[PDB]
Amino acid sequence: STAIVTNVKHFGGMGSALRLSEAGHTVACHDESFKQKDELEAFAETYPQLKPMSEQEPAELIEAVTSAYGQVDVLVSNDIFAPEFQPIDKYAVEDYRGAVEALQIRPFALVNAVASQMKKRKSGHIIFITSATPFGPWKELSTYTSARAGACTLANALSKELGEYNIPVFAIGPNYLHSEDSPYFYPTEPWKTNPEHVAHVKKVTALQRLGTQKELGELVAFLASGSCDYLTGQVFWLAGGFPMIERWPGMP
Amino acid sequence: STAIVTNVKHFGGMGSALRLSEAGHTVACHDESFKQKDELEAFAETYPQLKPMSEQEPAELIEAVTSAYGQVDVLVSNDIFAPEFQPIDKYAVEDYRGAVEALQIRPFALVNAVASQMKKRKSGHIIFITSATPFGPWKELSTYTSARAGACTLANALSKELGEYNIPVFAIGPNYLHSEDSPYFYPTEPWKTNPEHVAHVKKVTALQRLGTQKELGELVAFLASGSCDYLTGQVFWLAGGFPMIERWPGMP
Amino acid sequence: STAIVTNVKHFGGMGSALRLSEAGHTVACHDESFKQKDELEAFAETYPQLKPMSEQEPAELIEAVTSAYGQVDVLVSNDIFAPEFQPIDKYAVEDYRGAVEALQIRPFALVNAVASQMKKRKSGHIIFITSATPFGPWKELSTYTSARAGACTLANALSKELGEYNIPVFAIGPNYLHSEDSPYFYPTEPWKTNPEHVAHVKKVTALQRLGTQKELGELVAFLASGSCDYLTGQVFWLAGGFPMIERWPGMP
Amino acid sequence: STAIVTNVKHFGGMGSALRLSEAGHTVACHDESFKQKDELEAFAETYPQLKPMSEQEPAELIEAVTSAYGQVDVLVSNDIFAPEFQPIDKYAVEDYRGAVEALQIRPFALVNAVASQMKKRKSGHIIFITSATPFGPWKELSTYTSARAGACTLANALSKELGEYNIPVFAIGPNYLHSEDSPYFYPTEPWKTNPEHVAHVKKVTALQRLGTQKELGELVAFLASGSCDYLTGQVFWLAGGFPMIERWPGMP
Ligand SMILES: [Br-]
Ligand SMILES: [Br-]
Ligand SMILES: [Br-]
Ligand SMILES: [Br-]
Ligand SMILES: [Br-]
Ligand SMILES: [Br-]
Ligand SMILES: [Br-]
Ligand SMILES: [Br-]
């Protein structure tokens, strides 16, 4: 198969991509960093089993991989955006506007992009790596949330129509997924090093730990394998127990 | 209390506003047709208990109702849009934008301009008029539907930060809400006078009929009354027992 | 008309049974204590506007309220059961049949009793008083929490078939709803008193307070009044914003 | 590691035993007929790779598997009970008790029986094969719908507690699942051999095809492999798009 993975360096890209590559797929990797040739180069060096594309814009990115690698069989729209809290009256309209464009409009394009070619041949898989915040909203983060829920309903609606040309559609919304080196959204520090953050993570995720790239990677590879296409329309909540709820006074 | 019904001429506007003024409120009324000094006077003649505003903009409007009627106690962001039934690749990426700027960005643009003045009084109510399409998505309407899901989620998210100031925030997701003269989204023509359509209503709705303005106006006014701010963060499905799932061969 | 409220001395009992009477209905009231002619006489005493019953079984009560008061236009299955917090291997399978029996079996038995008459008169309103627990469970409450889920769903499944008959069915799932002296499930002792139970109830909710019987009643009477028929099949989370999710460390 | 798969001859039961074993899992099965020697033996003889047990009571089944095969690492509760459509009032309260008993008490009891070992050792996978009816309740299948519901929350609620003992808990809820020979609940005829039903599935599912036993089995195997435990608490709608919402008039 020929896959794509956007923002490979953040959120869930190195976990998706490599599990994808480990499975012998052709994985083209999009990252804004890959705008600088000094960058894309070392990446295509650090991971020779991957394919970092300089192509920035949605549709042209699809074009690079398709024309460079025959086509694109799976789309893993790993979308990211700085979740910078703010009571509603302190944000700005462009603040909300910029999250919808990077968490909502962005993946819609990629599909409006690759859509025709998967449909023509009757094959392809589409996966949005959204976010589990809607499943449980914190206070003061409305812009990023409404943005994530928007994408999730898109994947679900996108299935009632796409099951036609045999293209399963799903969305994996993460919460507390270890981003390691990446600041999007839970890096090693302090998330694993600090006692308050680790005690937080233990208290909020049922599993009492952070999530791994390998875990998400296994699911995308499984969804992207046709082994269970009948799962289409599903909104996967990869938050290891989250959101954990508050027990009454007394109950330890 | 002083209420604000947007697009009072369409969708849930006339239902809310007329019954909002019915329950005692000074209902300020926004509508794009009221940009013309002409129109703002046409509708006013039709309804003397309503107060039509010419202001189109979120901040100017709220600013106007503030300087016009003391404050803005209740906001009914009765949003509308005339999307399209298109296969993902048949929409322009521009089409999704507008859908988001409509069903999503506007309600937020309003909340962002009124939220400020409400938090001081530690009183107020926010009601979004959304859609019940996220509950049961239709193939080829991934825009309008998902945008609405964005508005719904933003409504629930905002409930998180606004309740700290005792401000309820809800969303009402209609479906088959008879709209009358308004082509948003179930005008009497032909949903009540055309055999094929009439039939589509009776077959997909539990009550088997379009809902009434009095019904949608009752809820809005019910929520806006203070009778149960404890529902805050709630999304109402005003789709009337809808959706109905087709049953096995033979079954009626 | 005539409406019935089960377990009226508990849960959302008082709020529903006094508000329905306020709205103008003849409210036959059921309750465990009404087994004793004294209790029924003492209740009917304190509240000559409510109609306490002796009947204990589903068809028994409804058939009795039919012969005495003409018919049963509204039914509020105020269900309860003293929940338990145990590791699932600590429970006894019987304990689940107890939860299931009272939380799902009682409501189904009643509707199975009344459906018929409402169906013939194409008029009637059914309300279920459940919980918001299936939305933000608590560990070790697997019995009650899940049992309620089937009740929440029992209500939803019905609204589809009873809608061709013009009969709405609603599910009210509250939580942290102060119940006076009723340990079902938030008595003033020790929730409106004990600082420990005060800080907590004041924490998992966006409104920071228990919900009031007044809010439960307003909603019960709003739905039964027959003003918003179109919300049929709706489940209401009367949790006042519950739950508030533990934000990361360092955040207020 | 050892696995159990109940009612193996029906529902998701076979795909379950078949895929699991192929993975290297010893799979101890359960099934009413296994109660008869000839029954169980032809099974042990037909499916040599499988390990059928004669034990049928939940309490009885566990100690026996834990005996012959040391322990129970994976619990797959494949709960059945034939659905009996009919208006709510024609239903006998015993027809809802019967549905729940077999769909809520049975799986609760199994975990009750097997938990502490999985908890004590701190490893194990719990998987409930419930249903997708609560996703799109057809008209008139109440009892069986709200039943699958409780079983679904049972799993979500349980995952919250067993997350400390590291035991993911899942609920795979299918519809249109091909049960080959089994009548539970989609057999060969007429689903794959009656233009009528092929046409029904052709409309209600997005993929206009039924769900294979292999896809279900494959989901069963992946969920208990340790590859994506972070999905703990997830309800999986395995219905290939069901339900497809009938769009407005004139649309193809
Ligand atoms: Br491949
Ligand atoms: Br918020
Ligand atoms: Br995350
Ligand atoms: Br929890
Ligand atoms: Br509508
Ligand atoms: Br409660
Ligand atoms: Br089977
Ligand atoms: Br099925």
Automatic annotation (TrEMBL), chains A, B, C, D:
Gene3D superfamilies, A to Z: NAD(P)-binding Rossmann-like Domain
- Per its UniProt record, what Pfam families does this chain match? adh_short_C2 (PF13561)
Q: Origin, by domain of life?
A: Bacteria
Q: Which family does it belong to?
A: Belongs to the short-chain dehydrogenases/reductases (SDR) family.
Protein name in the entry: Halohydrin dehalogenase
Q: Which gene encodes it?
A: hheC
